[PDB]
Amino acid sequence: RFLKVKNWETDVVLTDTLHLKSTLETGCTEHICMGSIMLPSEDVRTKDQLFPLAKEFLDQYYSSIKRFGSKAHMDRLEEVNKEIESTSTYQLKDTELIYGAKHAWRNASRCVGRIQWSKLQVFDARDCTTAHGMFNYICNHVKYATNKGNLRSAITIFPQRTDGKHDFRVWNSQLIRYAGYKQPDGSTLGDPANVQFTEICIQQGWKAPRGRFDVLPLLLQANGNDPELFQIPPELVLEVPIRHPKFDWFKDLGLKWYGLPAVSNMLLEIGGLEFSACPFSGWYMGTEIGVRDYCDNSRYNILEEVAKKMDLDMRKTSSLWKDQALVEINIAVLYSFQSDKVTIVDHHSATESFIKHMENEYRCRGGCPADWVWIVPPMSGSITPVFHQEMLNYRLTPSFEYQPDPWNTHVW
Amino acid sequence: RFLKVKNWETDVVLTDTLHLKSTLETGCTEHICMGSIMLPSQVRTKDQLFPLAKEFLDQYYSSIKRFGSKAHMDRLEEVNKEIESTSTYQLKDTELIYGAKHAWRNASRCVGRIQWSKLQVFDARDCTTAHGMFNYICNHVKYATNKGNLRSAITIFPQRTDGKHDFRVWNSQLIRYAGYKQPDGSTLGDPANVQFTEICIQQGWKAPRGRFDVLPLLLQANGNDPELFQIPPELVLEVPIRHPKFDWFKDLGLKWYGLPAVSNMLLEIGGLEFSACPFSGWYMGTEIGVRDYCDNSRYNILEEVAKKMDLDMRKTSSLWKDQALVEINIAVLYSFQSDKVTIVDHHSATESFIKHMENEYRCRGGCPADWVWIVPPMSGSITPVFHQEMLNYRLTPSFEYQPDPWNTHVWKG
Numbered sequence: 005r006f007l008k009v010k011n012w013e014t015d016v017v018l019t020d021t022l023h024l025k026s027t028l029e030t031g032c033t034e035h036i037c038m039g040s041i042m043l044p045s046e047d048v049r050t051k052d053q054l055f056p057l058a059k060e061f062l063d064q065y066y067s068s069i070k071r072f073g074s075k076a077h078m079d080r081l082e083e084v085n086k087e088i089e090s091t092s093t094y095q096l097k098d099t100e101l102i103y104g105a106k107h108a109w110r111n112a113s114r115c116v117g118r119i120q121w122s123k124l125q126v127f128d129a130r131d132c133t134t135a136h137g138m139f140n141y142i143c144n145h146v147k148y149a150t151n152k153g154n155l156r157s158a159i160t161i162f163p164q165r166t167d168g169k170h171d172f173r174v175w176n177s178q179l180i181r182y183a184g185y186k187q188p189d190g191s192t193l194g195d196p197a198n199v200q201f202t203e204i205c206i207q208q209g210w211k212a213p214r215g216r217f218d219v220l221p222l223l224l225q226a227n228g229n230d231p232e233l234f235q236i237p238p239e240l241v242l243e244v245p246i247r248h249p250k251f252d253w254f255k256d257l258g259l260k261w262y263g264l265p266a267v268s269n270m271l272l273e274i275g276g277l278e279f280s281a282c283p284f285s286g287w288y289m290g291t292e293i294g295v296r297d298y299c300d301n302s303r304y305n306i307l308e309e310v311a312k313k314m315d316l317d318m319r320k321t322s323s324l325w326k327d328q329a330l331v332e333i334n335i336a337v338l339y340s341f342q343s344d345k346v347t348i349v350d351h352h353s354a355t356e357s358f359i360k361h362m363e364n365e366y367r368c369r370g371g372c373p374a375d376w377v378w379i380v381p382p383m384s385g386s387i388t389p390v391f392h393q394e395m396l397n398y399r400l401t402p403s404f405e406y407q408p409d410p411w412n413t414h415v416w
Numbered sequence: 417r418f419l420k421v422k423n424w425e426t427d428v429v430l431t432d433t434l435h436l437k438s439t440l441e442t443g444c445t446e447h448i449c450m451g452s453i454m455l456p457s458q459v460r461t462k463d464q465l466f467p468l469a470k471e472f473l474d475q476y477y478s479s480i481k482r483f484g485s486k487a488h489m490d491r492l493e494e495v496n497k498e499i500e501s502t503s504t505y506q507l508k509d510t511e512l513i514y515g516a517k518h519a520w521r522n523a524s525r526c527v528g529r530i531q532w533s534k535l536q537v538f539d540a541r542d543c544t545t546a547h548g549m550f551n552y553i554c555n556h557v558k559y560a561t562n563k564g565n566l567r568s569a570i571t572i573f574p575q576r577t578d579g580k581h582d583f584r585v586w587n588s589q590l591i592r593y594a595g596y597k598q599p600d601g602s603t604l605g606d607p608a609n610v611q612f613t614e615i616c617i618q619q620g621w622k623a624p625r626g627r628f629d630v631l632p633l634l635l636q637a638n639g640n641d642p643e644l645f646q647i648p649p650e651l652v653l654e655v656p657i658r659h660p661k662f663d664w665f666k667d668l669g670l671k672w673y674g675l676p677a678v679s680n681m682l683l684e685i686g687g688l689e690f691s692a693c694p695f696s697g698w699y700m701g702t703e704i705g706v707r708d709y710c711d712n713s714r715y716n717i718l719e720e721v722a723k724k725m726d727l728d729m730r731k732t733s734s735l736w737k738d739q740a741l742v743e744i745n746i747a748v749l750y751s752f753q754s755d756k757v758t759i760v761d762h763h764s765a766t767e768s769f770i771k772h773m774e775n776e777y778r779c780r781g782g783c784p785a786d787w788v789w790i791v792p793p794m795s796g797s798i799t800p801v802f803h804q805e806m807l808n809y810r811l812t813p814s815f816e817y818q819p820d821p822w823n824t825h826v827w828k829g
């Protein structure tokens with residue numbers, strides 16, 4: 005049970021001991037594997053639920069600074085112990101906060117970009133009290149992370165849950181996303197994935213330009229209050245016009261995308277403490293836009309339009325016109341970003357980086373939890389090295405977790 | 417207990433009750449998922465054999481709507497006495513056919529299972545020698561091939577008894593190309609087959625030493641040392657690969673065989689183990705175009721193809737690899753269709769499987785599926801299986817992996 009993982013392209017074999025420190029459960033059993041389930045499974049921590057969680061976290065922390073078993077360690081354990089017995093919760097030291105966040109990223113088994121995990125910019129926003137205040141922290145995040153196209157990793161951490169009545173939440177799924185409107189006649193204009201949220205905004209007071217690439221407004225909820233709309237200043241939203249380096253007609257498709265991927269609907273858990281609002285951001289892998297955002301049938305779905313322009317034989321599937329078109333689109337996305345000097349990585353580069361990162365983690369940590377179903381890119385799978393890499397998936401803490409959408413729960 | 421799966425593209429939700437009939441184990445635990453391990457670890461006595469027999473017979477007679485009948489009870493009784501008396505038992509023909517078909521049906525890594533009920537089962541349980549094996553296999557190949565109009569088939573050799581008298585096909589597939597390790601480090605032919613090739617040569621094979629030499633059959637009967645046989649070339653249907661627009665593609669000198677026929681797996685039915693049971697269907701295009709040609713550890717022709725297309729091969733973000741892969745796959749499909757050899761593209765096959773899967777949820781209560789393997793090795797998310805949640809669990813009858821015989825065999829000499 006000190007498990008081994010093989011790379012079948014290189015015969016490299018790695019021994020995993022880190023999985024033995026796993027806390028939470030996977031959702032698999034000896035009888036059934038649920039590795040392809042998108043999301044397997046009021047609850048405020050009780051007093052005695054929280055001490056062991058806090059102790060577990062402080063133990064890793066003081067080991068990581070080579071102070072395990074020290075006076076400083078013991079003192080802190082005691083101090084937090086006292087504070088929970090007293091206040092029914094506790095507060096992280098800035099240093100612990102930063103360690104917790106960086107390690108939540110390190111432990112994210114579905115993330116392929118984790119080779120960068122130690123270079124995360126952490127913005128402490130725990131002094132925040134209002135949606136306007138939240139708006140301000142978020143604008144600063146966006147401007148810092150964007151950095152004129154030279155993107156930088158960042159997370160902004162708002163106050164922690166207390167009793168579930170005073171939660172901080174960003175209602176958008178990403179800080180920057182295009183709107184989606186269902187036409188009265190056909191299907192959808194803009195981005196179909198955002199049709200419900202685009203409507204909640206409107207139903208909350210937003211006036212929409214009803215274009216195909218309208219940046220959504222922010223819906224910000226502080227201390228469990230009704231949320232508020234804020235438009236992100238356009239000069240803070242860096243966008244890229246999409247053109248092909250060979251096909252002049254590509255520009256005429258009229259497509260663009262934003263440079264900053266910034267997920268804002270997940271929950272960060274450290275030492276038992278729950279941060280329900282913690283937007284984090286990095287930079288795109290090319291296929292996230294080109295393969296998923298543009299070509300998914302339930303998104304922009306521009307494949308047929310493009311194949312048309314290329315004059316491919318769309319009569320039978322065995323001509324592989326979708327594949328051919330798909331490649332060109334993704335060539336264009338990378339070409340556009342690179343030309344405009346906005347940070348982006350191709351799926352070949354990022355998967356190779358991740359193999360290197362796996363190597364490092366097995367060597368200096370004893371393993372690296374990884375979710376094959378998510379790590380392997382949605383195109384050209386087997387000509388990337390992660391395809392032939394066996395991976396073990398297990399859940400370590402600190403972690404990012406999913407949480408219900410606010411509008412289904414909000415005590416309005 | 418119910419279990420739901422969701423298709424995230426169509427929002428279709430299905431309910432799995434079949435997983436409750438699962439007996440075997442996955443390799444996963446409460447705290448670890450081993451879903452991407454290629455071969456998880458996941459001589460049998462009468463102690464454990466009659467429960468296994470009873471389970472199978474209960475299934476079998478349920479499917480034919482005779483559960484609890486006299487024919488069912490007498491059959492149970494007959495199998496019981498045969499086991500306590502002889503320490504094994506024999507399957508009737510009907511049972512064997514049901515067995516092989518349900519094994520395929522239960523094969524969670526197989527995207528082609530829509531076809532599972534149309535399997536041609538050849539009973540070679542009266543075979544006793546390697547020569548007899550060679551003859552059964554020749555006939556399999558002739559029948560399956562059918563002049564390019566392929567037919568699914570399986571040939572079943574005698575079951576294991578004491579594990580000292582096993583029937584084995586030492587080839588991983590009935591038809592495969594040689595691989596030769598050259599002194600300078602390079603490989604001639606198929607790198608996947610170098611080790612098996614070396615065995616054949618040792619056993620007295622005279623190697624042509626080309627890049628597409630069909631390997632000889634290495635056949636073991638009754639636990640005896642294996643013998644070489646050459647498949648008659650008129651029986652091996654091959655297809656030269658050309659591209660519909662690139663005239664220089666044919667000059668790359670590629671070809672591939674038409675019949676995929678896997679011969680190293682173990683068929684388990686009602687506790688009985690059939691260690692030699694070659695089965696065949698037809699190719700999905702990506703098996704050849706993506707894995708056989710473009711894997712770095714295989715023929716690895718991406719470079720040569722990228723050069724002739726004059727692609728920007730300097731930085732990878734030009735996606736020259738991705739572009740070359742598509743053209744090669746286009747060529748493979750075009751060539752097979754032109755020669756009227758049965759083949760299916762990954763778009764058609766994944767679509768068929770989603771239909772199969774839905775049908776299996778309705779009429780059977782589930783469909784075990786291994787996402788890691790079902791999703792095609794190129795253009796993943798534009799196929800409908802990518803967005804489909806799947807539960808993976810093991811049912812019997814089943815096909816299992818077994819170790820290479822040259823590692824476990826006791827040599828006679």
Ligand code: HEM
Nearest residue numbers: 109112113114115116117120157284285286287288289404
């Ligand atoms: C810096 C470059 C980064 C790249 C290239 C990257 C790439 C990716 C990709 C491709 C996915 C799959 C999601 C999808 O396909 O839609 C993913 C998921 C994810 N990423 Fe990263 N990411 C980066 C930075 C970050 C950062 C800075 C964080 C947090 C601090 C992060 C946390 C996560 C998490 C939590 C998931 C989902 C994990 C889960 O659901 O368990 N990523 N990332």
Ligand code: HEM
Nearest residue numbers: 520523524525526527528531568695696697698699700815
């Ligand atoms: C008729 C057309 C068929 C097609 C297109 C097809 C396709 C495939 C493919 C692509 C794989 C994955 C192999 C790889 O990617 O390396 C697979 C796996 C498999 N197939 Fe099929 N197959 C077909 C017929 C059959 C038949 C006739 C049988 C047996 C009677 C069979 C049994 C299996 C088994 C046992 C596996 C591995 C399953 C496991 O380990 O769970 N298939 N199939």
Ligand SMILES: Cc1cc(N)nc2cc(-c3cccc(CCN)c3)ccc12
Nearest residue numbers: 265266267284285286287288289292296
């Ligand atoms: C920081 C970051 C960068 C990036 N390029 N992609 C991300 C993708 C995610 C992500 C996580 C869960 C689900 C999703 C959307 C599902 N395809 C995205 C989260 C963060 C990301």
Ligand SMILES: Cc1cc(N)nc2cc(-c3cccc(CCN)c3)ccc12
Nearest residue numbers: 528676677678695696697698699700703
């Ligand atoms: C009958 C049949 C047809 C087909 N097109 N592919 C198969 C592929 C397999 C197969 C199963 C496990 C492993 C492998 C090779 C390793 N990728 C192939 C087995 C049977 C097949």
Ligand SMILES: C[C@H](O)[C@H](O)[C@H]1CNc2nc(N)[nH]c(=O)c2N1
Nearest residue numbers: 040041042377378802803804805
């Ligand atoms: C059903 C399946 O689990 C789902 O489509 C997953 C598959 N793999 C993925 N992988 C990545 N990187 N992103 C995704 O959104 C998904 N979707």
Ligand SMILES: C[C@H](O)[C@H](O)[C@H]1CNc2nc(N)[nH]c(=O)c2N1
Nearest residue numbers: 391392393394452453454788789
């Ligand atoms: C390590 C990994 O599980 C291994 O490379 C698997 C991945 N998925 C696959 N899927 C198919 N269809 N065929 C394969 O050979 C593999 N190989």
Ligand SMILES: [Zn+2]
Nearest residue numbers: 032037444449
């Ligand atoms: Zn699992």
